[PDB]
């Protein structure tokens, strides 16, 4: 896992001079794809979430995050009326800071045990990036990076 | 967090003089509130628990505790009969050294999802210290402090 190092205003990907005084400065920052040249509209984005099965979901902790202009809340329904998105586990709630909430719904043909991201990103949630979509809680698609802060 | 190093005979909060040889030298001790000269009868102690909603409970283990002259057990229901307290998740049990248990039962309506302490103190279950009261299991009231033991 590459690690970022800063001199004054430049980022260096992991020098003996490169020092880290205490663990408090190690910071994990999660950045949304809103500014990553990714269309944030509902139907353009909906294509990126696809349903798979037989792969365990994984969760990572990121300390800080970016504001989200467009964040999605999913309550997808199977054609028979059942809901297919897995139940939100404890300790996971919605993305904290979002301007506009997309209550996207009604995608009938979901045919998998879980929903993963077709581009490789994570769903940020509340300081808990996940590789899977949990039902009923808002999120934003983005990436998680790890950094050592300057002293 | 104020880390309390041990002197040859005294305590100092916090130097190459202070040395420790392994993790077993780090000891987390749980001290009951009764050791602070606090009232212990049911009517006065019950006033130190209140009901709140919107904050998740967080639990921290502690390695050592002290005997509880009066440890508490709580089982309350609002008149609809619902269990206002959360169930005790697996891995949490009663406080292991108690002289006498107060099996308190109450009918006070629960305006909040959880019940927190009004003094900032923790609830002690076994080798865990949480911020919320749990059904059925017996808990003490106490605080967790970190120390280094002498060589």
């Amino acid at each position, epitope marked *: 896992i590459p690690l970022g190092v800063i001199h004054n205003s430049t980022l260096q990907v992991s020098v003996c001079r490169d020092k880290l005084s205490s663990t408090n400065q190690l910071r994990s920052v999660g950045l949304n794809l809103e500014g990553n040249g990714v269309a944030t509209d509902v139907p353009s984005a909906t294509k990126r979430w696809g349903f798979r099965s037989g792969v365990p979901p994984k969760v990572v902790n990121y300390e800080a995050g970016e504001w989200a202009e467009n964040c999605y809340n999913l309550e997808i*329904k199977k*054609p*028979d*009326g*059942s*809901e297919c998105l897995p*139940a*939100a*586990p*404890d*300790g*996971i709630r919605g993305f904290p800071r979002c301007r506009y909430v997309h209550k996207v719904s009604g995608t009938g043909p979901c045919a998998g045990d879980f929903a993963f991201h077709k581009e490789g990103a994570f769903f940020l949630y509340d300081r808990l990036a996940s590789t899977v979509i949990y*039902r*009923g809680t808002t999120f934003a698609e983005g990436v998680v990076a790890f950094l050592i802060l300057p002293q | 967090i104020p880390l309390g190093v041990i002197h040859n005979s005294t305590l100092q909060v916090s130097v190459c003089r202070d040395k420790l040889s392994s993790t077993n030298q780090l000891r987390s001790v749980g001290l009951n509130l009764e050791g602070n000269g606090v009232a212990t009868d049911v009517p006065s102690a019950t006033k130190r628990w209140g009901f709140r909603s919107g904050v998740p409970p967080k639990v921290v283990n502690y390695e050592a505790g002290e005997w509880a002259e009066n440890c508490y057990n709580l089982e309350i*229901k609002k*008149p*609809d*009969g*619902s*269990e206002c*307290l*959360p*169930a*005790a998740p697996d891995g949490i049990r009663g406080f292991p050294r108690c002289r006498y248990v107060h099996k308190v039962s109450g009918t006070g309506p629960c305006a909040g*999802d959880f019940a927190f302490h009004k003094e900032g103190a923790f609830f002690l279950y076994d080798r865990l210290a949480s911020t919320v009261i749990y*059904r059925g299991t017996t808990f003490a009231e106490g605080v967790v402090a970190f120390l280094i033991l002498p060589q």
Partner: antibody, heavy 121, light 113 residues
Framework: QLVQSGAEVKKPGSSVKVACKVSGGTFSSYTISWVRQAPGQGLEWMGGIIPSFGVGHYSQKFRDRVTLTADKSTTTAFLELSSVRSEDTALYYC?????????????????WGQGTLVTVS | DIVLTQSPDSLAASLGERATISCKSS????????????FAWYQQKPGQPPKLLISWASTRESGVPVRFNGGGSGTHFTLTISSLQAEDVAVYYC?????????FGQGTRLEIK
């Protein structure tokens, strides 16, 4: 409250239709559930349908030989056995029974029905 | 599937006594983040469709006397008939709705001793 038709006798190996009319509330979004109270052998939830989606969420044991329909024209839920056998002589109840968003279309509960008796000749 | 079992198949107690019915689920039916658990008790008097006695294993329904009590968690759930009455004679059913398919227990027949 719900209503149903009367008891029905059917020859073995035929198709029996039981109708449950939902009067009151809103037929658009409810969770119709059919339960087969065997006489003295507990209960079992054959399956449920939401009239909005129109396709029943059949149980694993009753997927093969049970079909369900919900029509808002007269606001009725129809249950049909593909084939009937002697052991299927039991009380068929229609109610509003939901799950943890597995099939939740409204509230988690509702009022049951009078119950239809089906017997096999 | 979540199969339910009722330990007392036929419990009989005299008037005024404390009546316990235990019901052991195959899986946990207590939701994690929301401490609410999904378990309901049904009192069916013969010749009448079942009525929902208590939902979420704790909350008592409207019109139901305070006599009826609910408790338990995870797998083990308990229905307490606090003070038996003459009219309480009926059958009692477990129901889980944490995950489809809905499954009911075999039933407990409770009658005057």
């Amino acid at each position: 409250q719900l209503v149903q038709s009367g008891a029905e006798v059917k020859k073995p190996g035929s198709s029996v239709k039981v109708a449950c009319k939902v009067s009151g509330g809103t037929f658009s979004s409810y969770t119709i559930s059919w339960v087969r109270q065997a006489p003295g052998q507990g209960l079992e939830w054959m399956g449920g349908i939401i009239p909005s989606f129109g396709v029943g969420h059949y149980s694993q044991k009753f997927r093969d030989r049970v079909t369900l329909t919900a029509d808002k024209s007269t606001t009725t839920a129809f249950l049909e056995l593909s084939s009937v056998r002697s052991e299927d002589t039991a009380l068929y109840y229609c109610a509003i029974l939901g799950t943890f968003n597995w099939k939740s279309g409204g509230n988690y509960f509702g009022p049951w029905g009078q119950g239809t008796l089906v017997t096999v000749s | 599937d979540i199969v339910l079992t009722q330990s007392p198949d036929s419990l009989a107690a005299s008037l005024g006594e404390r009546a316990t019915i235990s019901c052991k689920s195959s899986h946990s039916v207590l939701y994690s983040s929301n401490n609410k658990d999904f378990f309901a008790w049904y009192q069916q008097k013969p010749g009448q469709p079942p009525k929902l006695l208590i939902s979420w294993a704790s909350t008592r329904e409207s019109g139901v006397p305070v006599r009826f009590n609910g408790g338990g968690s995870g797998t083990h759930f308990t229905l307490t008939i606090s003070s038996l009455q003459a009219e309480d004679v009926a059958v009692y059913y477990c129901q889980q709705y944490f995950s489809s398919p809905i499954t009911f227990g075999q039933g407990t027949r409770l009658e005057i001793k």
